Amino acid sequence: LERSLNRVHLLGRVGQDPVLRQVEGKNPVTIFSLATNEMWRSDVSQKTTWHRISVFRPGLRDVAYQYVKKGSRIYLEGKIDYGEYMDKNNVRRQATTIIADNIIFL
Amino acid sequence: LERSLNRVHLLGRVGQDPVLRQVEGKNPVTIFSLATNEMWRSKTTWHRISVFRPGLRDVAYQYVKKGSRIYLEGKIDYGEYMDKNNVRRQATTIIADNIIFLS
Amino acid sequence: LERSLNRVHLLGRVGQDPVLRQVEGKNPVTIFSLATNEMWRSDVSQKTTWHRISVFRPGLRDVAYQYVKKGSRIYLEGKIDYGEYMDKNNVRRQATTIIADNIIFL
Amino acid sequence: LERSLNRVHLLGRVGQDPVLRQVEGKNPVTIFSLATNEMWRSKTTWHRISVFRPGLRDVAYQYVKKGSRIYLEGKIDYGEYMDKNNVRRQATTIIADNIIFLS
């Protein structure tokens, strides 16, 4: 009955060296953060936004983990997943971009 | 200086009828939610949208109604704030483009 | 050694009812055209561009062929293929967007 | 009025060192070609880019050099003209965004 789209194109510099996350015994992730900048025209006034990148999928997890280093420019595509975790009845965010593709610019 | 990309493309159903909010003293924003959802072989994602753009916010107030199918493009903002010495997120996609599927 | 990208996101109204192209005995295509508009800010002055859409792939060819009608709003993704055909030694264009995906907005 | 999308995203190697051209009497454009290519299991596509934008064209003249890897976004223009009572195409992607991969 219906298709939706949740797509994110991000191109920026990696802020830190990636961490292989294997807490307790769940399905593993490669976590890194990407820096995106933004100058405002309303004038050269800027801002820098930090994206928590998560790499699920057996293909890209390992390749992201060994080759992505701090300072690398990366292009990627993924989907916005808000990390909706409960606390005391209600909920709050732990948002990630979950990667489907990275092109390394080198 | 170093060029970046921060683009989200969304297409889904509007979940709520838009609310006119105002950041700080004066800064007009229209806010709604949009559902997108994806299916596995054994999840609805709700996104808050902020249309701060001088004219796009007016149009989206006038014409975005709950359950509408919309296409939009924007940039992600994690909206980090301290509720009480504790970092939190108020993540929003600030919409720049917006193609409305109705008449 | 290297990845490139040739991607096109087009959202617009279909100009004519699609034609199943099977000239002589080649691999079949579903051809339709999409209308994209463009207002210029430099002021409400407009322009309308016509895209020759081509649908290869056994999945989408038939589905594009039966369901896409004149006047339908369609969203699609494809790649720019210039129809480089020779004449008398040199070459000229017959450009198509070759579709990989259509979302019908209904 | 009816909103549309006409967006191309390209990433490839620049094939030629940019030429400063001028449409009609006065309208500055920088033009280069970009190769993208895709591989089948048994093709280079050459695109002409026009940067007409007041400042982006200057930057791209200064800094686009042959063989550079570039990322760009633009809108397709089929450039239809009559050479002699016969319709022809001069297809170009008019670039709006342009993220340069060098220093």
Swiss-Prot record, chains B, D:
Entry keyword annotation includes Acetylation: yes
Chief location of this protein within or outside the cell: mitochondrion
The entry's keywords: Acetylation, Disease variant, DNA replication, DNA-binding, Mitochondrion, Mitochondrion nucleoid, Phosphoprotein, Transit peptide
GO cellular component, one term: nucleus
Tissue expression summary: Expressed in retinal ganglion cells, photoreceptors, pigmented epithelium and fibroblasts (at protein level).
Resulting phenotype, R13Q: In OPA13; may impair dimerization and tetramerization
N6-acetyllysine: residues carrying this PTM: K75
GO biological process terms on file: DNA replication; DNA-templated DNA replication; mitochondrial genome maintenance; positive regulation of helicase activity; positive regulation of mitochondrial DNA replication; protein homotetramerization
SSB domain: residues covered: 5-103
Subcellular location: Mitochondrion; Mitochondrion matrix, Mitochondrion nucleoid
Disulfide pattern: none
Domain of life of the organism encoding this protein: Eukaryota
Keyword presence, DNA-binding: yes
Residues modified as N6-succinyllysine: K84
PTM sites of type Phosphoserine: S42
MF terms in GO: chromatin binding; enzyme activator activity; identical protein binding; protein homodimerization activity; RNA binding; single-stranded DNA binding
Effect listed in the UniProt record for changing E73Q: In OPA13; reduced ability to stimulate POLG-dependent DNA synthesis in vitro
Subunit structure: Homotetramer. Interacts with MPG/AAG, through inhibition of its glycosylase activity it potentially prevents formation of DNA breaks in ssDNA, ensuring that base removal primarily occurs in dsDNA. Interacts with POLDIP2. Interacts with PRIMPOL.
Function in brief: Binds preferentially and cooperatively to pyrimidine rich single-stranded DNA (ss-DNA). In vitro, required to maintain the copy number of mitochondrial DNA (mtDNA) and plays a crucial role during mtDNA replication by stimulating the activity of the replisome components POLG and TWNK at the replication fork. Promotes the activity of the gamma complex polymerase POLG, largely by organizing the template DNA and eliminating secondary structures to favor ss-DNA conformations that facilitate POLG activity. In addition it is able to promote the 5'-3' unwinding activity of the mtDNA helicase TWNK.
Disease in which the protein is involved: Optic atrophy 13 with retinal and foveal abnormalities: An autosomal dominant disease characterized by visual impairment in association with bilateral optic atrophy. Atrophy of the optic disk indicates a deficiency in the number of nerve fibers which arise in the retina and converge to form the optic disk, optic nerve, optic chiasm and optic tracts. Many OPA13 patients also exhibit retinal pigmentary defects, attenuated retinal vasculature, macular dystrophy, and foveopathy.
Protein name (record): Single-stranded DNA-binding protein, mitochondrial
Organism of provenance: Homo sapiens
Gene responsible for this protein: SSBP1
Shown residues within the full chain: 26 to 141 of 148
